[PDB]
Amino acid sequence: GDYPAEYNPKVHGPYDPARFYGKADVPLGQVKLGELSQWLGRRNKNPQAVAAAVSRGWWRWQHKYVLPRKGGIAPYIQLIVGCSIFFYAINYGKMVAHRQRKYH
Amino acid sequence: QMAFTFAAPSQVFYNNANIRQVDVPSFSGSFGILPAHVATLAVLKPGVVTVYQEDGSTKKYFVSSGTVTVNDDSSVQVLAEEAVPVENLDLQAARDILSKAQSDVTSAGADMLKLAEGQIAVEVGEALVKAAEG
Amino acid sequence: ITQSMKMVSAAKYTKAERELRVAKPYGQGAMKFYEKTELKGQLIIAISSDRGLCGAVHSSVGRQLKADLAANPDTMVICVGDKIRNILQRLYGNNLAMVCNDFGRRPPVFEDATKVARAVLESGMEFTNGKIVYNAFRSVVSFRTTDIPVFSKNAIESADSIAAYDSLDSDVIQSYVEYSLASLIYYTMKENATSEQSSRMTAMDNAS
Amino acid sequence: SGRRGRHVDFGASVDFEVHMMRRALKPELRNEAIKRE
Amino acid sequence: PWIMVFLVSMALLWAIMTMVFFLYQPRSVSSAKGFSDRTVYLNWKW
Amino acid sequence: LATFLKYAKVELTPPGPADVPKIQEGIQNLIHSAKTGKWKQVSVREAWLNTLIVTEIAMWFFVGECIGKGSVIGYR
Amino acid sequence: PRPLRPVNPGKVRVGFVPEEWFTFFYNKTGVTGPYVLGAGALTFLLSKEIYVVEHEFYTGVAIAIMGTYGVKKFGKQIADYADKGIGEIEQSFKEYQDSSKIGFEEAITLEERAQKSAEAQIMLFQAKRENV
Amino acid sequence: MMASLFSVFDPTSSFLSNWLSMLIPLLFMVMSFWLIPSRPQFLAKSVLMGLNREMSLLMGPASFGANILVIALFLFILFNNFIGLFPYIFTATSHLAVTLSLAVPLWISFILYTWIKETTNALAHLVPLGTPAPLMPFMVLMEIISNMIRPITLSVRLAANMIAGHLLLTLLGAQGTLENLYVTSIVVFSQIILLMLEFSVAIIQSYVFMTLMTLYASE
Amino acid sequence: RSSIDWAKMAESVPESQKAMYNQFKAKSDGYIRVSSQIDAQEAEAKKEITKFIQESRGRIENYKAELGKLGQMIPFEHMTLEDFFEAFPEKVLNPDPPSPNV
Amino acid sequence: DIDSAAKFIGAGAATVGVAGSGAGIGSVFGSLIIGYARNPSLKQQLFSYAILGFALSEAMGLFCLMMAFLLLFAF
Amino acid sequence: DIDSAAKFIGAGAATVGVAGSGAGIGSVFGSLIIGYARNPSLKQQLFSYAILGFALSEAMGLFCLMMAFLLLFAF
Amino acid sequence: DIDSAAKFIGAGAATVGVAGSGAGIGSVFGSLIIGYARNPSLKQQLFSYAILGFALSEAMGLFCLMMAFLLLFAF
Amino acid sequence: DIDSAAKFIGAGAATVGVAGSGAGIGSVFGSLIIGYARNPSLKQQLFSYAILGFALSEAMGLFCLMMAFLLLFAF
Amino acid sequence: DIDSAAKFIGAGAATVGVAGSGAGIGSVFGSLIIGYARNPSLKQQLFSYAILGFALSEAMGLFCLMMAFLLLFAF
Amino acid sequence: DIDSAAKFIGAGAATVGVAGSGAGIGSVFGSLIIGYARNPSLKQQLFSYAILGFALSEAMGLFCLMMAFLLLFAF
Amino acid sequence: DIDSAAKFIGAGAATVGVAGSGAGIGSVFGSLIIGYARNPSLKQQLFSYAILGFALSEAMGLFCLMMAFLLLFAF
Amino acid sequence: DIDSAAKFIGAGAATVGVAGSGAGIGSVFGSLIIGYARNPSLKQQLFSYAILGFALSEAMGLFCLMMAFLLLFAF
Amino acid sequence: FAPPVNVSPLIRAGRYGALVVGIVYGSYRFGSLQKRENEWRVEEARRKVIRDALNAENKAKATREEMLYLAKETGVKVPENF
C-alpha cells in the first residue's frame, strides 16, 4: 500500500491519488471507435490495475464533490441513490417475482 | 432532645430551648421537625412556623422569611427575618397589601422586576390572609 | 467636652448593649451550622464608622487588615465605613472595589446587613473562602478583636460535611448563603457597634 | 421560583417579605415594630 | 458462508479502525517563543 | 416552472410540413454513413451522445404507449 | 502541477445529479433534452414493471421527505458550524507562521544587543585607566 | 389489515451477492487529502473527539489504547443500522454472523483476561456483596448463567431491534396503496414517524453498546 | 579634568543580569572627588569579542536560515497532509508510540 | 385449521407486552414533570432525556408488536 | 367453528395494553400533583407535559385496542 | 357452544385492564398524599388534579370493561 | 361441558385484575409513609386521603371480582 | 373430563393476581425505608402504617388465592 | 390425559406471580439505595427493614411457586 | 396438529415478558430525569448508570423474547 | 400429544413471570440514579446495594425461567 | 440556463414518429390483450369456481377430522354431526 512505481516526487510533484503518472495515454472520451478495441486491450486487466483505476475514479469523485471546502450533502445523497440503484440491480430477481401487474 | 433556636433580628423567642416539634413552611415544601431529624438546611417562605412546646401548649408564629437549619445532633435554628405570632395580625392590612400587590402586577406590564416584586408581595399577602383567619 | 460626651456614649451604650440581648443569639444560632460543618479557608470585610475621634479602634482594624494583606494579596476588600477606605487607599487603591458608607451615626438594623451582603454577592467577583473581621465585645472597659469565617456557595457545596445535609439543590444552597451571609454581617455589625462605642466612652472618660 | 428567575436575589425577596410583614400591625404595633434604619 | 461474512465484517472493522486512527487534524504550535528566552549575553571583566 | 415551459416551447416542436427534404436528407446521411463508415470514425463521447439521443427518442414510444393504453404503469 | 483546492464543489442539479450530465446534451437537444430523457426513462422503468413499486418504494418516499426536511432546515446551521471550525484551524495556523517570523526578528535583536555588549566592552577598559 | 410480505433476508439474490451490502461504509469513509479539513472531515473529527472525551472516564489502564477499537465498533454499528434501514439495502444483522463478530470475540477476550489475570475477581463478581451463607448457591448459579449468556443477549438485541424496525417498516409499506392519496399519505407519514423512532433507537443502541464495551473494559 | 561616558556604560549591561557594574558604579563614585594587567585583559577581551562576534554571526545566519525556510514553505491554505508531513518531520509512522488522537 | 386459530390467539397474547411500554412512557413523562418542577432552566436537556427514554420504551413495545405480526402473517 | 372463536380469544387477550395505558396515565397525573406542589407557578408547562404524557399513554392503549379490533374483523 | 365458550374466555381475559386502572388510581391518590404533605396551601388544586387523574384512569379501565362486555354480547 | 369449563377459565383470567388493586394499595400506603415522614402534624388529612385512595383502588379490584363472578354465576 | 381440567387452568390463571400484592408489599416497605430515612423518630407510627399497608395488600393477595381455591373446589 | 395437560397449563400460568416478587424486591432495594443516600447513619435499621421487605416479597413469590407446584403435583 | 398450535400460543404468551422490560426502562430513564433535576454536574455517571439499568432491563426482556423464539422454532 | 402442547403453553406462561424482574431491575437502577445524584460520595455503597438488588430480582426472573424450562423438559 | 436553440430535425422527427407509433401500438395491444384477458378471466373464473368447490369440500372434511381429533384428545363428548 504505497505509491505506484510510475510516480517520482522529484519529477511529478505532490501525490494526488486521482492522478495517473504513467504513460500519457489517449483519453477515454476521444477514442475514434475504430481503435477502441485496441484501446481497451492497451490497458492492463489485472485486479491490481482495475483496483487502481477504480480508486483513481473514486478520488476524482472525492476531488470534485467532497474535498472542496464548501462540500454539501450532494455527494452523500449521490452515494445513497447509487447504492439503492445497484442493490436494486442485485435484488431485481426478487423484485420481478412480486410486481404489481400481471400482463404488462 | 431537640435544641431549637427561634430568633428574629429584634426578638428571640427560643434560645436553644427544648422543643418537641417544629413545623416550618419552606421553599422545599412545608415539613415537620422532630428530635433526631435529618440534617437539612431549608430556606423559609412566608407562613406560620408553629412550635409544639414540651409543656403541651402550641404557639404559632408567622415568619416573613429566613432559613431553617436542622443539625445532626438534633438541634434546629430557625432564624427568621420578621416574626410576630398569629395573635397580633390585622386582616384588613393583609388584604390591602394583597390588593396593592395585584394592582402592581396588573400595572407592571413589561416591567419584569416590578412583576417579580408584585408576585413576591402576592405570596406574602396570600400567606398573611391565610394566617390571620385563625 | 470629653467628660460631657461621656454620658452621651452611655446612652449610645445602653442602646447598643441592651440591643445586643437579642442580636447576640441571632448570631450564635447563625454560626451553629458553620460550627458543625467545620470548614477551613479571598473575601475580607471591614466594620467601622464614618466618624472621627474614635481613638485607635480603626487603627486596630487597619492593623489587622495590614496583617491580612501579607497572607492573601489577591483579596478585594469591601468595608463598612469610609474611614477604613481612607486609611487603606494609599496602601491598596488598586484593590478597592467598593466600600459601603453612611454607617455609625445610627444604630444598625438588618437592612444594612442585607445591603452589604447584596453589594458583596452582586459584584460578580469570584471568591470561595472569606472572613469578616469585626471588633467583638467582651467587657465595657476592654474588648477583643476577632473574625467570623464566611463561605460562598461553592465552598459549602463541595464540602465533605454537607453530604449529611439533605433536601438540597442549587437553588436552596444559593438562597441559604445570601441570607446566612446577611445574618453573619448583622452579627458583626451589632457587636462592633457596641465595641466602637463602649471603648469610645472610656476614651472620652480617659480625658475626663 | 419567579424570584430568582427575574434576576432578583433572596435579599430583595427578604426585604419585600419583611416590609409586608411589618405593615400588618396597624392599631398598636406598626409604631413599635419598625425602627426604620 | 458464515466464515466469509465473519471475514468480511472483520476486514471492514479493521478498515474503519485504521480510518479512525488516521482521522485527526495535525496542528503546528512550535513557534518562536522558546527563542526569546535564550538572550545569551557576554559577561564583563573587572 | 415557467422557464422550463418556455424551454419546452422552444425545444419540443413537432417537425413541420415544409422540412421533409431536410429530415429525409439527414436520415439518408445516417443510412449512407453507417453502412459505409463514419461510425468507426466517431469519438466515444460523440457516439455515447448519439446513443443517448436515440434512447431519448425511443422513450417517446413508451410515453405514447402509456398515453395509448390508459394506465401508465403497465396495461390493464 | 500542484493540485488546487476549489472553494465550491462540482455543480449539482436536481439536488444530487451532476450538472455535467445535463450540459452534455446541449449540442443536441438544449435544455429540456436531459429532462425529457429522465422523464421517459422513469416512465419506461415504471411502465414495464422493471422498477417495481413495492413496499420499499413507500419507505424511500418517507426517507426522502425526512431527508429533504433535515437538509433544508439544519443545512445552513451545520455548514456554518463546520466552516467556523475550518477558519479557527486556520486562525490557529495563522498564529503560528506570523508569530514565528516576528519572534525570529525579536531573537535577532537579542543577538544584536549581545554584540552591543562587545561593542561597549572596549570602552570598559578605557574607563578603568582614569582612576590611576 | 389486508396482508403482509416477507422473505427479504435472502443472501443469494444474484451472482453479485449481498456481501456488497456490508462494504458500503467504505464509500462513506471520510478520506482526507488537504491540510485544512473539509466539512464532513471536520464534523466526523468533532464527533469522534466528543465521544473520546465522553468515554475518557470509562477507559481504564488495561484498555487505554483500545478506545480506537471501541470507536470503530460504534461506527460499525451506526453504519450497519443507518444504511441498513434504507429500502433497497438488506438487513445485514438478520444473518447472525455479523452480530457474532461484532459482540462475541471481545467478550471472549475480556472473560479470558479475567479468568487468567484476576481469578479472585472472577470468583467475587458473581457473589454479591453482603450476602450471607444460605443465600449463596442460587445466586451463584443464576449469575453464572446470566453472565455466560449476556453477550449472546446483547448480540441478539442488536440484531432484533433492527429486525423489528425493518419488519414494521415493510409491513407499513405493504399496507399502502397508490390510488388513494389519503391512505398513501397516512402510510408515508407513519413511516416517517417510525423511521425517526428507528433512527433514534439505532443511535441509542450504538451508544449503549459503546458504553457497555467501555465499562466492561474497565472491569 | 577626566570623565567617561556613563550613559553607554549604564545602557550596556542588562541591569540586574550584570549588577556588578552597579557595585562598580558605587565604587567609581567615590573616586570622582596594574596598567599592564589591564592591557593584557584588553587583549584577552578582544579575542573573546571576536569569538562572541563570530558566534553571534553564526546564530544570526541560523535564524536567517529558519526565516528562509518559513518563507519558502507553501502556505497552509493549499497544502496537503503529505506536504505538512514533509515540511514538519514529526509525522505519524509505523514505529511510533500508540496514541488515540495521534 | 387450528394453526391459524392459534396464530390469532398468539398475536392476541403477544400484544400484551405494549402495556409495559405504555407504563414506561407514563413514568418517563411524569418524571419529566417532576424534574421540570426542580430547576426548570434545564428544559431542553430534560426533554431530550424524556425523548431518549420514550424511544426505548416504545422500542420495547415494538418488539412485542413485531412478535404479534410474526405469528400472524409471517409464521 | 374455531377460527372465529380464536379471534374472540385473541381480541380478549389483546385488550390488556389498556392496563399499561391506565398505569401510565395515573403515574403522569400523580407526578403532575407532586411537581405542582413544588414550584406551583408552572401550572401551564406542567399541565402541558401531563397532557403530552397522557396522550402518549393513550396512544399505546389505542394501539393495543386497534390490534384487538384487527384480530377480530381484519386478520 | 365453542364460539360462546371463547366469547367467555375473551371477556375474562379482557377485563384485566382494571388492573392497570387500579394501579393508576393508586399512583394518583398516593402522589396526592405526597404532594399535599409538601405545600398544603394548594389543597383544592391538588385534589382537582387528583380527580382528573382518577377519572382518566377509571376511563382507561372502563375501556377494557366495555371491550369485555362487547366481546361477550355485541361484536 | 365446555361452557362451564370456559366459565372457570374466564373467571380465573378475570381475577388477575385484583393484582392492580393490590399494587395500587401498596403505592398509596407507601406514599402515606413518605408523606407522614415529613409533616407529622397532618395525619388527620393524610390518612383520610389514604383511606379514599385505598377505597377507590380496592373498588376497582372489587369491580374486577364482580366481573369474575358475572362470568360464572350470572351469564 | 374437561370441567376439572379447566378448573386447573382457572386456578393457574387466578394465581397471577398475587403479583400485584407482592409488588404492593415491596412498595410499602421500600417507602418505609424512604420515610424512615427522613425523620426516623416516627418509627412506631411509620411501622404501624407499613403494617396496615402490608395487611391491605395481603388482603388482595388472599382474595386472589381464595378465588383460585374456590375455582378449584368450591365452584 | 387432558387433566395432565391442564396441570401443566396451571403450573405455567401460576408461575407468573413471581413477577410481583421481582418487582417488589427491586422497589424495596432501590428504595434502600434512596434511603441510605439520605441520612446514611441509619444503615443498620435501613438494612433490617429492607431485608424484612425482601422477605415478605419473596414470601409472596414462594407462595405463588408453591401454588404452582401444588397445582401440578397435589390435586 | 396441535403441537405447532401450542408453539404459537406459547410464543405469544412468552413474549409478554418484555412488558416488564418496557416498564423498567421507562422507570430507569424517568428517574434519570429526576436525578438530573438536581446536581447536573454528574451527567456522565448518571448516563452510565442509566445505560446500565436500561441494558439489564432489556436483557431480561430479551431473555423472554429468546425463550419465546426457542419455544417457537428449536423445539 | 396434548401433554407436549401444554408443556409448550406452560413454558410460555411461566416465561411471562420475568417481566416483574425486569421491572424491579429497572426500579433499582433508577433509584440508584436518584440516590447517586444525592450524596455522590457514597458511590461504592450505593453500587453495592444496586448489585445486591439487581441480583435478587434477576434471581426471581431466572426462577421463572427455570419453571419454564422445567415444565418443558422435566415435568 | 443558456438560451435555447432549436433542435436539429432528427431528434424531433424520430421523437414524434415514435410518439404516434407508440400511441397506435398501445391502442392495438390494449385491445388485443383486453380480448385475451376477457377470455382468460372467464376460463380462470370457471376453473377457480371448480377448484374452490373442491377445496371447500376437502377443507370441510379436514375440519371434521380436526374436530374429531380434538374431541378424542380433550375428552369432550363427540357430537353426532361432528
Numbering used by the authors:
A (entry chain R): 3 to 106
B (entry chain H): 15 to 148
C (entry chain G): 19 to 59, 66 to 232
D (entry chain I): 11 to 47
E (entry chain Q): 8 to 53
F (entry chain S): 26 to 101
G (entry chain K): 1 to 132
H (entry chain N): 1 to 219
List sentences from the manuscript:
The local refined map for FO at state 1 had a resolution of 3.3 Å. The FO domain of A. franciscana has the same subunit composition and overall structure as the mammalian ATP synthases. It consists of the c8-ring and a-subunit (subunit 6 or ATP6) that form the proton translocation pathway, as well as subunits 6.8PL, subunit 8 (ATP8), e, f, and g. In addition, the C-terminus of the A. franciscana e-subunit has a different conformation; it is more curved and extends towards the c-ring lumen compared with the ovine ATP synthase. The distances are suggestive of the following interactions between subunit e and the c-ring: Salt bridges between eK61 and cD1 residues, and eK79 and cD1, and a hydrogen bond between eY71 and cD1 may form in A. franciscana FO. The residues eK79 and eY71 may also interact with the c-ring lipids.
ATP synthase is a unique molecular engine that uses the rotation of its subunits to perform the catalytic reaction of ATP synthesis and hydrolysis. Here, we performed structural and functional analysis of A. franciscana ATP synthase to study the molecular mechanism of mPTP inhibition in this organism. We found that the channel formed by the A. franciscana ATP synthase dwells predominantly in its inactive state and is insensitive to Ca2+, in contrast to porcine heart ATP synthase.
